[PDB]
Amino acid sequence: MEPAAGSSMEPSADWLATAAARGRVEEVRALLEAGALPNAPNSYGRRPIQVMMMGSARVAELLLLHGAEPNCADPATLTRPVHDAAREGFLDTLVVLHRAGARLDVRDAWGRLPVDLAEELGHRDVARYLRAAAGGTRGSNHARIDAAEGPSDIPD
Known part of the structure; x- marks a missing residue:
């Protein structure tokens, strides 16, 4: 298909996600x-924030405030973005999620919680706020x- 003019049809959002996964706040900040x-x-069946490296809550801010998927999760393991924050021990991300809209009382399909993961990895700061x-x-x-x-x- 002769591209470079009519091809593309690119929902350039993948960048706000790839850049986020690469800990690139400036890239996503301007992209979004x-x-x-x-x-x-995306091709990882993950939301645009669940794959933001979980090392920069700033990325989640722009994304979340723009309309990321802080609530929706994966239909395979129900992995909500709430786990991704506590997984890396990032409480700043948890705040953004609950600061705009994010269900933090879900399960990872199997039955684990986002607060149960933090306590196991050592993210007390997140496991504490998560249990709240x-x-x-x-x-x-x-x-x-x-x-x-x-x-x-x-x-039950």
Whole structure:
């Protein structure tokens, strides 16, 4: 197909994602501000922020504030972007997610939580804030449910 004029049809959003995965805030900052798609389908079946290197909450800010996928996850393992933040121990990213719109009480298909991963890798700062917004729960029985909608006068 004679390209270089009518080809392309490129949802140049892949860049805001690839640049994010490469820890490139400046690249995404200008890209998305230039027209980068906020919800573009990548080849990794991952959202535009779940693949932002998780080493620069700034990337999630532009993306999230622009319309990233801080809520939607993967239909294969339900990996929400909430895990990606705690996975690298980045609490700044968690704030942006809950600062604009991001469900932090999901599961990784298998049954693990974003707060359970942080406590295992050593991201206490994120596992703590996660147990508050992500797993907003306590213990014992009765109250706001007392804990992860399960252990209480509620069997699940």
